[PDB]
Design a protein around this ligand. Structure first.
Ligand SMILES: Nc1nc2c(ncn2[C@@H]2O[C@H](COP(=O)(O)CP(=O)(O)OP(=O)(O)O)[C@@H](O)[C@H]2O)c(=O)[nH]1
Ligand SMILES: Nc1nc2c(ncn2[C@@H]2O[C@H](COP(=O)(O)OP(=O)(O)OP(=O)(O)O)[C@@H](O)[C@H]2O)c(=O)[nH]1
Ligand SMILES: O=S(=O)(O)CCN1CCN(CCS(=O)(=O)O)CC1
Lengths: 427, 439, 50, 427, 431, 189
């Protein structure tokens, strides 16, 4: 009754989406072949949110797997849980955008977006009542960033009323892996501001820092970071699929956390993250859970919230718990840190509780925050873009597909306006 | 699904292609006679052989190569060698007389004889592959055939295809170890064409690889076989991302976008840092940090130039084997924090990282030891403008007296081409000077 | 030498495509040391932590 | 009760008949040796429709194999089901008709027609109550196109009231493998229009297109095409062998479809045809089955049904399904495509639901369509015949066997009337 | 069940028969002594009851030197010793000697042997006459033999394989006369005359096979491959079998238009076949190249009327249909407007068998494109020009008229061939 | 798996040797059962291993440039009906072997082209019987045989049933055992 359409774009988007679907199938007890092997009636109930029916208790996701490189489709199919997806939902081009925003946004992305929209519309029309769309991509690349932004614009044009959540992986200079990432990020920020209901900024630096200092993982790979992002993504929409004492869908979170239309860039997080060595030395009750939630070192946006007060906060709890403890913990964390919250808003934290925790955990909480620390996240990109555009480096690659310097200036101005909007409420 | 075309021109190009195709045959498990003994490899993810070797219904695999030369000696040596049955007989194009180390002979007089046949064979190969990704061109930068015929074929290919990528692996003349007295003439005449029509030209010096073999391999008196093997290793590591699975795959278009900032500033360097003997490898730890550090030292560059005088502009590190991105990030941080390694101010991030999960293969009898990790550091550094300056100085010294101009003008090539090429190279050096200086 | 009879033209692939219950499902596991296996283990897997 | 006599004429007819008997043996559990190895009582209660009991649990099919060249019949004897047929039922000549209608209809065919009629009469007199005749042939050949028509004439003279069913493979220009096939096609349709009661038009082009687009088969051999035709043949007469909620035998179909004596040419099809990749990810339901039945790409004739108004249609569903769903789906198909059906017939389609699906299949539906678009095949054959007859291209071969140039003129004119009548009701 | 009588006349016919029977013995696994270490050989061999296999052939030739070579050769044990008909004096490249004078000496014995072969049969399909137009006996004796066969077996088919004079390469001075005289008897009695040319096969061997100096031992092998591809449908099963009757029905539009060409597609060297993808589309496309026909004529200057493609080996019918559609899309290959479906297809499952030491390479599939086109009229025009030049001055007609033969039949045959070429020109006109 | 034919009327024993000459004799025109068994077992092996195309086919064997031997294990069920319990294809090939210390070899050794056992009979301990029968019939020791891209399960099979471990891998996707005493080195370092 509240179906969600999932779109994966680019290599990072496809890998995070594969991890996300693996985690959801774990939660719903769905076999990797599409069969249902769950043991609880709750998992099968309201399974239509993320899955369709294929007869003989076989369920397939509503995912649309999108990339300009067929190698990503081959890897997804060969990887675990790759048999779960519908083959007709695999849409691909001849070759990747090559880290070029224009290549993936004006010619190859334009040619493939028709097929992608056809698949998305076919999936959406089958739903009884879709709540909205969620999309996973990376801002640093060409294919993901550019053509995912094109998809965002097209879908927002087609479905103006539905909730649009993008879990974009923003680039950071510490863990830079490409050269022309600032150009694509700056060109995508404008589209993300314009045509998204709520976007969850994710950074690789923050995920590596979490895996290194919160966990004690030796040689973390992309799989662990994708699993953390997957856990956050699953915990965001846990109320839609399971009963709870105080439910909250995506629209409720958007209402709570968006004081103003452009101020919807969130900061995700996960509560029960702790090392394997410290499993037995630390309890997992509500107080320490919220303490982690609001800890500055447990954020996936690679920004210190201590440099900017939160506009709003939201901790979506899971598992059996008492609302009194949750409410008093939220009040304590909002009063003891009054310098880290805005005064002009009386209550900053929205609390949601679900009765089903993730498998293997007694209770879990997902923290998302509309802090003003995103100022630094976009300031890094603005600085890099300004430095590169001062001497017009690598610009001929973008101008060779139809772009112009005027569009680059427009994107830079829009992102500067957004960061100024965050700044002027910091005070 | 993704295929590239390898074109080898001149004696140096054909000889380097020998090592390149030996490396490919060992890497993809293809016997030199053409047969592929592994039937199970004809399926699943093991379909990587289609990138280089075209499949036939008889079970044989035909390399997508065009070994063209104006003289028949080297191609006949191939035809009598071990790889006689590997290449298609029609692809092995031969002339009757070499270019005699003359640019004009290879460009017009002898070029026009077989340029049509070469283009026909290239078109026939291209029409067979449905996922043509680009062209790999191997040629001596200062030879006769490898200059003139390479110029002609490159301009004809640019006319015919256009948007398809074209990557050149040239043998740049060494500052001191030059085997012919007329090397700079051919070098600067072909500089005009290789700049206009190519996309990424990775020049190589024989003396630099000689020094690398002497130091890192303790090979006192090396030969051309070692140089060809090293160049083949570099090309295999470059093309590894097109046929193997790994995090951060780098396509040819990704490489060009990341590394080439301007249409004319497209002449990078190349180095295969983890070169080491079988003995020193036991003592070395051979981790990501040290192999990344060894890339940037001046003694590991395969062009005889000192990078310290030239600020780096864009670096593409193509890792292989057991590599985790955290190690690459730590190595990048340590490289950026170094004061000696000077980058430009207009490139805040200049590292493009490509990781592959296929460890490098080692040819039996080769000097390179078996390693778990490998990396190619292709840097668009400005310091090679010193090498171009040396070449221009040599050209000026010979052209002040008209040393051998009559040889060139006797084959239908005008004398004004020398001045045109000299001013083009001067403009290229001026562009490098303009780009290198900080804002 | 003798005349050769062929069985490929006598194959009936449609007779199997008309089934709707026979499902293979189980598939072989790629070599962990192979690049595909390494990718599946690193970018498509995670160390369990909870 | 309601026994059916099956006759296989020519190479194509023999191949199709062998595949059809293999399919039926699979349906009824008949072992290739002729024994019964089935597991359901409903598979044996109506074994007399297609088979004769041999006493020792052996059920020889009621089939007559006729072909002028012995090579095909030797291949059938050496084939997988060579022991099934009665050895004396094999009737053959010395040399084939040589793709000559006159050779296979006037002298060489007529030499063997006496024996063929003798064995057909012997098989028919062994039935409790004969229903009709099934004959499989190809219009393009000589042996088929001539001998089949002569046999049809002889049987119609002998049995004027029994139903006659011919599964003819009409030649197609795109898969033309004979230089003089339009001549044989015209001289065959001349007798087919007057004599038979239901001709199922099959085109190799349409079958190849089905195997390519739908089943995604890279190398479709003749086994696949014969199996498709066999599935259609099994679906048509499934109400004579298994119980069903709604029953429709051959006579019921003949009454329901044809409004006029000469309009008895049908376009068949099959609903559950799905590729291996989409086999698991597609839920087979009555709406999907009906949509695939009425899909233009699923037709087994080259002519597009969208180019002419449907006269009558018949979908013979198989499997356990609710009659309300079937009726609502068929009515929805009629309403959506109201321009594709004749307005002077209120209900344009006949429905039949059977209880026993094909083995290994949960739900199936066989489509039989009678549309004016079938005139396209006859128009193409007429154009080719006119082109060759303007100069008497190969007429000397036919005139050498006793034919006349006036007979060829009559056949072309008579087939033009068939095109005219089909075009008459299409506006 | 279905067996074919083969007759070889003249030195050219006898040597072509040697190659053909070597190829047949290799294909069916029959040793030169005749012993075989199922029903495949029934077409081209007769069971002796004792396990030996005698080929169904007659080697007739006036000069005995080539038949003596056979009788002293490796295959001396295959053929029936009384089936190797011999004479004493050759025709000396004279039509009259082979037709009347020396012909009547052994025509009765040849007819008796042919009748003996036909009586020991149940399923006779046709005749395979191998001869050369330019030769003396291979023209006159062939004419007389076919004249008697058209009377004794008026219903059975008569497939003739004739060596044709080349446009330039010549080995005789009076071969135009013999060819012109034989063109009379080809129309009257024969049903399909697959003429081939020595010069065309020379060019094929020089270009495709790359052999520089072939001497009849590659030409005969190629002709044997062609005839084996033609007759493979009668002894090996497969999809879309093509018997001789349907072959003639599809290939012969009018009683006088019965002179098809011949072509074998995958004729490539051993070292070049290993590196080539010999797809069905590729071989079908290279069938229609002018430099691949075995008659020295340009098919691009005429209109195709009926094309038979007898594919062999591992071939999928969909590939054949796609290749034929590709051929029909091209405008260079013009077909007559009155034959919209001028393609006849045969797909035999048996791949070709390559002889040891032969020039042909081992391939998985092959096709023999047999096209009836109006472009063959150029060769008849060339022979008309040569005959007119040689007959204006009456160069050697005295040798003919001095051997019990009339002068007027020269002009009669000349106007017969003129009528034939006029008929071809008329038929080639689009409606 | 199951085939509607009585395989006991052709095959003289449970595990029947099938050479190229044997397969040519057992033509699909009159002996379709053996060809269908080969093709279906090859299709099952390809489906289980996930290969893009089927590598084991009757036509691919009969027309192969080199002689190949395939092994079939069956079981008569009732009348004209039988089941198939495995498939094994072996043959001799020229391999460009490379042992330790970068020694180059060029020796003729047995190859394991295809080895597959049905899942229902995989736990019955019958693949060992099939391999023992192959070794007895072709009198080749495990020392001088080569494995074409051996799967993991094959690795445990070898190291458990023959105590052969540490399969040295060659450049041609072949993992021959640690027994390189076949012949002298064509080249030494
Ligand atoms: N759908 C099928 N079409 C077939 C099959 N076999 C042949 N054909 C087609 O049939 C057409 C010719 O039919 P036949 O080959 O059966 C000729 P017929 O037996 O009627 O006459 P003769 O020439 O006297 O043998 C031609 O288009 C073939 O491609 C088959 O198994 N299935
Ligand atoms: N690394 C390497 N350098 C080579 C090789 N062959 C030639 N060179 C260098 O390339 C330059 C000349 O190359 P040639 O091979 O002489 O050039 P060409 O144009 O092919 O010569 P012609 O065929 O005589 O016209 C010199 O600097 C040589 O040292 C080779 O096999 N390997
Ligand atoms: O032998 S037993 O039946 O006990 C075990 C099954 N056996 C294992 C070894 N191989 C599998 C190799 S592969 O098919 O996985 O490559 C044949 C099957």
């Amino acid at each position: 009754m509240r179906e969600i359409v999932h779109i994966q774009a680019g290599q990072c988007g496809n890998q995070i989406g594969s991890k996300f679907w693996e985690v959801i199938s774990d939660e719903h007890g769905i076999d990797p072949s599409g069969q249902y092997v769950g043991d609880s009636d709750l998992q099968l109930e309201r399974i239509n949110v993320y899955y369709n029916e294929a007869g003989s208790n076989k369920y397939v996701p509503r995912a649309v797997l999108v990339d300009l490189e067929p190698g990503t489709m081959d890897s997804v199919r060969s990887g675990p849980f790759g048999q779960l997806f519908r083959p007709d939902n695999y849409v691909f081009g001849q070759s990747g955008a090559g880290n070029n925003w224009a290549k993936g946004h004006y010619t190859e992305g334009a040619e493939l977006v028709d097929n992608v929209l056809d698949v998305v519309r076919k999936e959406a029309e089958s739903t009884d009542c879709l709540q909205g769309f969620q999309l996973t991509h990376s801002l640093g690349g060409g294919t993901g960033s550019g053509m995912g932004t094109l998809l965002i614009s097209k879908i927002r044009e087609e479905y103006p009323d539905r909730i649009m959540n993008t879990f974009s992986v923003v680039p950071s200079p510490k863990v830079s892996d490409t050269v022309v990432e600032p150009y694509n990020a700056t060109l995508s920020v404008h589209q993300l501001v314009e045509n998204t209901d709520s976007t969850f900024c994710i950074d690789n630096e923050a995920l590596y820092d979490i895996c290194f200092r919160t966990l004690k993982l030796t040689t973390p790979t992309y799989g662990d970071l994708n699993h953390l992002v997957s856990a956050t993504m699953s915990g965001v929409t846990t109320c839609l699929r399971f009963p709870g004492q105080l439910n909250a869908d995506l629209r409720k979170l958007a209402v709570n956390m968006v004081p103003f239309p452009r101020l919807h860039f969130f900061m995700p997080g996960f509560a029960p993250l702790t090392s394997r060595s410290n499993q037995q030395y630390r309890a997992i009750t509500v107080p320490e859970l919220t303490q982690q939630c609001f800890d500055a070192k447990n954020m996936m946006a690679a920004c210190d919230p201590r440099h900017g007060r939160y506009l709003t906060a939201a901790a979506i709890f899971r598992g059996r718990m008492s609302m009194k403890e949750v409410d008093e913990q939220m009040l304590n964390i909002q009063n003891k840190n009054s310098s880290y919250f805005v005064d002009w808003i009386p209550n900053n934290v929205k609390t949601a509780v679900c009765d089903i925790p993730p498998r293997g955990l007694k209770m879990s909480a997902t923290f998302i925050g509309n802090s003003t620390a995103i100022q630094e996240l976009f300031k890094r990109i603005s600085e890099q873009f300004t430095a590169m555009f001062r001497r017009k480096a690598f610009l001929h690659w973008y101008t060779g597909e139809g772009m112009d310097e005027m569009e680059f200036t427009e994107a830079e101005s829009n992102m500067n306006d957004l960061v100024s909007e965050y700044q002027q409420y910091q005070e | 699904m993704r295929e590239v075309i390898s074109i080898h021109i001149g004696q140096a190009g054909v000889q380097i292609g020998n090592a390149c195709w030996e490396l490919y045959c060992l890497e993809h498990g293809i016997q030199p006679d053409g047969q592929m003994p592994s039937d199970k490899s004809l399926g699943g993810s093991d379909d990587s052989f289609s990138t280089f070797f075209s499949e036939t219904g008889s079970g044989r695999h035909v390399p997508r190569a065009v070994m063209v030369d104006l003289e028949p000696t080297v191609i006949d040596e191939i035809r009598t060698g071990t790889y006689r049955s590997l290449f298609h007989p029609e692809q092995l194009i031969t002339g009757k007389e070499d270019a005699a180390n003359n640019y004009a002979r290879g460009h017009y007089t002898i070029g026009k004889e077989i340029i049509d046949l070469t283009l026909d064979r290239i078109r026939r190969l291209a029409d067979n592959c449905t996922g043509l990704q680009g062209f790999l061109v191997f040629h001596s930068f200062g030879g006769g055939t490898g200059s003139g015929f390479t110029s002609l074929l490159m301009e004809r290919l640019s006319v015919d295809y256009g948007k398809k990528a074209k990557l050149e692996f040239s043998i740049y003349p060494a500052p001191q170890v030059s085997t012919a007295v007329v090397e700079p003439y051919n070098s600067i005449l072909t500089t005009h064409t290789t700049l206009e029509h190519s996309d990424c030209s990775f020049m190589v010096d024989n003396e630099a690889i000689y020094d690398i073999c002497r130091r890192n391999l303790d090979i006192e008196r090396p030969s051309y076989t070692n140089l060809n093997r090293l160049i083949g290793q570099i090309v295999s590591s470059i093309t590894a991302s097109l046929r193997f699975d790994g995090a951060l795959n780098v396509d040819l278009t990704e490489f060009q976008t990341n590394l080439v900032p301007y249409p004319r500033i497209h002449f990078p360097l190349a180095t295969f840092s983890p070169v080491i003997s079988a003995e020193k490898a036991y003592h070395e730890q051979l981790s990501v940090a040290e192999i990344t550090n060894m890339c940037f030292e001046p003694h590991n560059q395969m062009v005889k130039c000192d990078p310290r005088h030239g600020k780096y502009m864009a670096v593409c590190l193509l890792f292989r084997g057991d590599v985790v991105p955290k190690d690459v990030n730590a190595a990048i941080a340590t490289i950026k924090t170094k004061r000696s390694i000077q980058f430009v101010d207009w490139c805040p991030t200049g590292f493009k990282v490509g990781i592959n999960y296929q460890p490098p293969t080692v040819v039996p009898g080769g000097d390179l030891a078996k390693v778990p990790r490998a990396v190619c550091m292709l840097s668009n550094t400005t310091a090679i403008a010193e090498a171009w300056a040396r070449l221009d100085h040599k050209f000026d010294l010979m052209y002040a007296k008209r040393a051998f101009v009559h040889w060139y003008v006797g084959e239908g090539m005008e004398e004004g081409e020398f001045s045109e090429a000299r001013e083009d190279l001067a403009a290229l050096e001026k562009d490098y000077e303009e780009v290198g200086v900080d804002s | 030498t003798s005349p050769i009879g062929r069985n490929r033209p006598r194959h009936d692939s449609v007779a199997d495509l008309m089934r709707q219950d026979m499902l293979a499902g189980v598939r072989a596991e790629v070599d962990p040391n192979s690049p595909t296996g390494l990718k599946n283990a690193r970018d498509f897997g995670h160390r369990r932590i909870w």
